[PDB]
Ligand binder design. Sequence first.
Ligand SMILES: Nc1nc2[nH]cc(CCc3ccc(C(=O)N[C@@H](CCc4nn[nH]n4)C(=O)O)cc3)c2c(=O)[nH]1
Ligand SMILES: Nc1nc2[nH]cc(CCc3ccc(C(=O)N[C@@H](CCc4nn[nH]n4)C(=O)O)cc3)c2c(=O)[nH]1
Ligand SMILES: *c1cc(=O)[nH]c(=O)n1[C@H]1C[C@H](O)[C@@H](COP(=O)(O)O)O1
Ligand SMILES: *c1cc(=O)[nH]c(=O)n1[C@H]1C[C@H](O)[C@@H](COP(=O)(O)O)O1
Lengths: 264, 264
Amino acid sequence: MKQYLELMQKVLDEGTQKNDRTGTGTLSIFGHQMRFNLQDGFPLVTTKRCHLRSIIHELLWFLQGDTNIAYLHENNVTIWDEWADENGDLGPVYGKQWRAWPTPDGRHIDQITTVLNQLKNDPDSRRIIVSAWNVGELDKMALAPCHAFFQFYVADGKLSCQLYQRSCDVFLGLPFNIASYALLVHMMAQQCDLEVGDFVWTGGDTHLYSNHMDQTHLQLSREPRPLPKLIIKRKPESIFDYRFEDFEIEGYDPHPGIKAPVAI
Amino acid sequence: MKQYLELMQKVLDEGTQKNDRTGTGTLSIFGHQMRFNLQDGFPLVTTKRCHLRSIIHELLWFLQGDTNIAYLHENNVTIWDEWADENGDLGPVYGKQWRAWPTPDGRHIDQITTVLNQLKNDPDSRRIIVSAWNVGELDKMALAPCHAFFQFYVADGKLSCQLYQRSCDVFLGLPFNIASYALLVHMMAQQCDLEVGDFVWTGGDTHLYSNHMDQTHLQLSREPRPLPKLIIKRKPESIFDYRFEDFEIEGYDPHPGIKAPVAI
Ligand SMILES: Nc1nc2[nH]cc(CCc3ccc(C(=O)N[C@@H](CCc4nn[nH]n4)C(=O)O)cc3)c2c(=O)[nH]1
Ligand SMILES: Nc1nc2[nH]cc(CCc3ccc(C(=O)N[C@@H](CCc4nn[nH]n4)C(=O)O)cc3)c2c(=O)[nH]1
Ligand SMILES: *c1cc(=O)[nH]c(=O)n1[C@H]1C[C@H](O)[C@@H](COP(=O)(O)O)O1
Ligand SMILES: *c1cc(=O)[nH]c(=O)n1[C@H]1C[C@H](O)[C@@H](COP(=O)(O)O)O1
């Protein structure tokens, strides 16, 4: 994608060498924003082949309020293996926080249901937010939330969404996160009889791992192709009733995949 | 300021009319980002006279972990009166979340202190965040946090900071919010013996109220003056020991003030 490849280059030209948590070494910038008119097509990277099943199941896994990789395994998704404990648990990560944010007094808040109701009863609201950054449970998570904060917006019958990503792996994580959220907006818009608007991506520590340099240079020399089109084949009774089989992607003709190691 | 005036013009150029909570009506855009290099000067608006006294006292108040307006009152600051109750309380807003975010297990987290410790011992951490968005306590707050989430970053011996403001009153709130956070970066940098870097502002629902239109065009017809300079006359033992008198603003020659009604 145009703006993705532009960021990829910005990191190379302006990045600062940082010794990170993993001890791998990164080239990073702080503060960046991108916008994606979803009307113009689904923002699934074409300069390299991405794989929907991993993106879709993780998202459905989230909406379920699940924090154990069991579900991801029944479905052949291995992305969260290196951080799961002996029993497959990751702690109160994304899913738990989206569906059951524990109040100080023992109650639980369902941010997704809250959001749905807001989009239906008070679309002008400036408080339609979902936060995964629960400070009280940070120490109990296998890895702190990278995509930590998102806000929805409605204007002219269109649904937009802005995500705040505190930490971003430009090569590996980014393509994933962008598609994952674009997909949620489409699911949100369908359940709220609204058209899709923009997907604004805002990042904090945006970096390129030092052992991804070759793959990056390889990716930068490929011309981006027309973005595909997402087609939702059914309208479930609720946002929680979506199955993998409901999503279809037309016209995705990407350049071959590029393999790269994950920093643990 | 240049960046500020460009934002105002942007809202006017591509804003959509939206009804809001206060029943005033707004002109609004979603998602925007700007940057202020603190080395260039203190980002205090010059196209209209700002009352720095209120800005400073609010911040010291925040850092004290206070949520009652008594303090602001004994220093003649009245910016929060319209939302306080009979006893002057605002509920567990900014001050409380920053210094004592209540966990589910009975603990309380001092986000400000943990950040100071992170800047000192692990400045390369991609988790130096303070969040005022406490889902479990939103219902107890007089007004939901506007400047809701912020992240620090270190590079080349300079301290930067990015703020996510979910809702922005461009005319009234923004000039204050920009100055407040810049001041904080200066305070943090001084305690960690770091130089000031960039302040990055990011907005969700960025808007201009309908009864601010005349004032907005009046301000836009002005030429920004050169930025003021911030001088701190002392280095206190802790980030919590600063006094009003420790700050000195020099070279501030703004255009005349412009009055406008606040939407409650
Ligand atoms: N330092 C780092 N640690 C992380 N922990 C979790 C994430 C984001 C989720 C994620 C996990 C694994 C991959 C991955 O490892 N992706 C491979 C496997 C290929 C594949 N995935 N599914 N089928 N084939 C690839 O070549 O795209 C991609 C995203 C992540 C990251 O971003 N970077
Ligand atoms: N819809 C709206 N509601 C809000 N509640 C809290 C805020 C931000 C804090 C704030 C409160 C009052 C003023 C204000 O009303 N500022 C006046 C008084 C002038 C003054 N302040 N102190 N001495 N003189 C002005 O002319 O700048 C500015 C910021 C705020 C906002 O932004 N907009
Ligand atoms: C985290 C998870 C995700 O979905 N997206 C991402 O890009 N990441 C990346 C950021 C970073 O490379 C690593 C997390 O490390 P840290 O907690 O920021 O130190 O995964
Ligand atoms: C809130 C507080 C602040 O520090 N600065 C701001 O700009 N505001 C503004 C945003 C909005 O105009 C109003 C809060 O209302 P709502 O919660 O968005 O409905 O004050």
